Ligand binder design. Structure first.
Ligand SMILES: Nc1nc2c(ncn2[C@H]2C[C@H](O)[C@@H](COP(=O)(O)OCCCNC(=O)c3cccc(-c4cccc(Br)c4)c3)O2)c(=O)[nH]1
Ligand SMILES: Nc1nc2c(ncn2[C@H]2C[C@H](O)[C@@H](COP(=O)(O)OCCCNC(=O)c3cccc(-c4cccc(Br)c4)c3)O2)c(=O)[nH]1
Ligand SMILES: [Fe+3]
Ligand SMILES: [Fe+3]
Lengths: 462, 439
């Protein structure tokens, strides 16, 4: 067993430690070759055929790079090759939990199928990671290369999903994989506080590569000039002051990707259509899991053996099906091929109001059809004619939450409107399955009255 | 009306409504599910791209070239109708590709049905006809100024070549356009000098997705391209100062062939996928016209069934529980675990000899029949061998190259079996009179 070299269009030659290779060459990891990074965006952006597998490789590579650079610059931090391998594995496996079409699956489908359950792709990543280890004898390999499986598995899972929870006192280091003097390690793969992690670096670069958008962030420069420094008796990753411009570009790039691609109107309508087909197919598709037990699309998340076989393939399985009981679902997918899509009715925001929770998504269409427009309208619409799409931008923490250092005093952190505009953390769009112009006028009337009733933003276009 | 597409390599791409209506069909959308490089993706994580985007690019480039020629040289009499027909031909040139692209017509069908002559170009013509007739395109073509009778034939001739050659009759064989428009047949698929918009797009795109340097600039070609007479025939000619660009292109191609298309592990994996397909052929069902069920290897006889034959077959086998599919499944599972066929050696045919597809299936048997020379402890059957045949393909105004390579891999992995396989391979090369292998 020796290292391997993979040639990647974003990162060039990426070296893989044999333990990482052993983890990658499993059904549980190879599964990610069959889940598109951007879900339905590929039906708007023909270049966006990339899957979660290559992005995961990139994230592992970048995690290794950043942590090694910090160790080389600062021996005093006592970063060991064991720590590097654990951070690399966490970067590799952070997206194991994604379902078909990525953010579509846990963002919208599962809430609509089982409003009662609380599912995230991060929980799924933890579950798939455990399953991959116990299905492939990874623990002896980990030991072979100096890892301590109990502690280090806990550390990886903590990087992926976060602390054990049970806040309780909260004045105390909540993690168990590593102690406080290695806190900065938890800031590499997934950093919620300020929004700078190697995961975002890779998918910013990769999505820009595949979409045709320019990426002005130089992650390599940032890695070169990153260090560890002291803030409030804690240790954090900080950037050289001279890097401010780089960060500006990063944030702007983020904004562009969100505005032009991630919340593209037609792409999200198509995500909605695919989810509708999945909902109308859920009762009739079986996925065989542990013990030959059958599962549905919406319940495969409860058995990782079944989840392992749940990918974008399900789309085609519905499209190619001959079962009469699936015809409904099939038809919707066929409308996608013929480009007979749901009609965009409008957009609104819950500005100043409580935001819409996942557990309530299913109730929204009914609400819309229950609005009473103050005109005859001579055309009545039902709940199933409406789609309500809730688009959440998940980060209010600009550059301000970043720590900087001077080349004069590297160990200590330092104490404009040109920064990117705010994110509008929740958008609510409505589409109509009926396409005749009378039905669309009626649907718009219903939508405007519904926004009035909910005290949401008055829709534009009027 | 006029849609715009935002391609990663061509930027913004405006599309005529007729082209959009051709694209928005199951028969064309199918290409979203066929990977451009087949199994190369299992070696290059960036090579996730499919034939659909490539086809869009080829149509766009064909339009660009024809229109650029038309703006210049008005004496050629290029109508918008000609531009639209060329764009459609470029758009539809790859409709006939099967699962994993060149793996299908290049290896799988020859092994499965050694007696049929199948190519993805003739499949493209069949699928184009099926698309036209299943979605009422002819009235739309008329609506935009086309003559379906002449122009459908024109498109099919652009894709597959002359419909003729039943007898000698050596003269102008095209029926879709007169000889004075002959140059239009050189745009989408050029058989003479290997210069066409299809190659431009897929060189650029494969470079973009593989991480390989693209040294040439097709825009310079289009801007400095003209039509001129060469030996009493109209042809696409280039301003002389463009030679430096031309060479660059041929370097890129060369690199793309050596680094990616002929990658040893990628070709081994193509072979493994084909072996799985063979062991699933008796059992996989693909519903076709009238509800008749087809196999993978016979789905090419019904375009309705072929419309539903894509890379998904792979996963259909991987996810199956039918015990009859177990063997196929296991091969795919080995791919996931990276327990691959072992590489035994490489050789070349001598002189102009070219092994033909109809004989591919005979090659392993031959290898297992060679008498090694000394003796052997382990004996290997024909099923233990894979013989992989790899092929590679005067412009008017530097590396290995070998018309055919034959590589042998072994399925048994132990050292003893691999030594035996090497002995078989070297003897077989001696018996066919092929070049003695390496080492
Ligand atoms: N066409 C296409 N575009 C593609 C493709 N790959 C990427 N693109 C890029 C370029 C496009 O400009 C962009 C956005 O898509 P769009 O189709 O132009 O629609 C935009 C408006 C919202 N869409 C609908 O509501 C709609 C649209 C069209 C028809 C119908 C309809 C018609 C009859 C009955 C019914 Br019932 C529904 C509804 O995506 C592709 O393969 N095909
Ligand atoms: N691993 C991986 N690499 C990947 C991946 N995506 C791209 N790559 C790039 C990086 C790699 O350097 C390059 C080439 O692939 P390789 O896996 O390194 O194998 C090279 C020789 C193949 N030939 C064999 O026969 C072989 C090889 C190894 C083991 C066995 C074997 C072992 C036990 C029993 C049996 Br029975 C067979 C056989 O592909 C990926 O997902 N995974
Ligand atoms: Fe990620
Ligand atoms: Fe092509």
């Amino acid at each position: 067993d020796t290292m391997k070299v993979i040639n990647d269009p974003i990162h060039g030659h990426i070296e893989l430690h044999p333990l990482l290779v052993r983890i990658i060459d499993t059904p549980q990891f190879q599964r990610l070759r069959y889940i598109k990074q951007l879900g339905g965006g590929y039906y708007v952006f023909p270049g966006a055929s990339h899957n979660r597998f290559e992005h995961s490789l990139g994230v592992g590579y970048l995690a290794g790079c950043l942590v090694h650079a910090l160790g080389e610059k600062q021996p005093e931090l006592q970063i060991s090759e064991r720590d590097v391998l654990c951070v690399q594995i966490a970067g590799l496996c952070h997206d194991l939990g994604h379902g078909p079409f990525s953010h579509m699956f846990d963002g919208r489908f599962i809430p609509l199928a089982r409003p009662e359950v609380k599912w995230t792709h991060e929980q799924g990543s933890v579950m798939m990671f455990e399953h991959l280890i116990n299905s492939n004898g990874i623990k002896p390999v980990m030991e072979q290369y100096g890892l301590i499986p109990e502690e280090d598995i806990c550390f990886i899972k903590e990087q992926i999903v976060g602390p054990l929870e049970s806040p309780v006192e909260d004045s105390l280091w909540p993690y168990k994989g590593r102690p406080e003097n290695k806190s900065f390690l938890y800031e590499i793969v997934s950093n919620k506080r300020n929004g700078i992690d190697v995961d975002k670096w890779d998918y910013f670069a990769r999505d820009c590569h595949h979409l045709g958008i320019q990426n002005n962030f130089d992650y390599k420069r940032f890695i070169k000039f990153a260090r560890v420094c002291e803030v409030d008796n804690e240790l954090r990753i900080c950037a050289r002051d001279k890097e401010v411009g780089n960060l500006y570009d990063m944030f702007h790039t983020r904004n562009s990707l969100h505005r032009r691609a991630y919340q593209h109107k037609v792409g999200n309508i198509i995500d909605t259509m695919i989810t509708d087909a999945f909902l109308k197919a859920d009762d009739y598709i079986e996925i065989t899991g542990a013990g030959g037990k059958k599962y549905r699309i919406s319940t495969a998340i409860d058995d990782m053996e079944a989840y392992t076989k749940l990918t974008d393939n399900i789309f085609l399985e519905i499209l190619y099906s001959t079962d009469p009981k699936l015809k409904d679902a099939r038809e919707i997918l066929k409308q996608i091929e013929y480009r007979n899509l749901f009609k965009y009715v409008g957009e609104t925001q819950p500005t100043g109001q409580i935001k819409i929770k996942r557990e309530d998504y299913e109730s929204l269409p009914k609400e819309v059809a229950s609005a009473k427009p103050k005109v005859l309208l001579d055309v009545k619409l039902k709940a199933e004619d409406f789609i309500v799409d809730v688009i959440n931008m998940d980060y209010k923490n600009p550059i301000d939450h970043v720590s900087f250092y001077c080349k004069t005093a590297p160990n200590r952190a330092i104490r404009s409107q040109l920064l990117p505009e705010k994110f509008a953390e929740q958008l609510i769009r409505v589409y109509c399955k009926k396409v005749d112009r009378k039905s669309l006028y009626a649907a718009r009337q219903y939508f405007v009255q519904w926004c009035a009733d909910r005290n949401f933003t008055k829709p534009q276009d009027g």
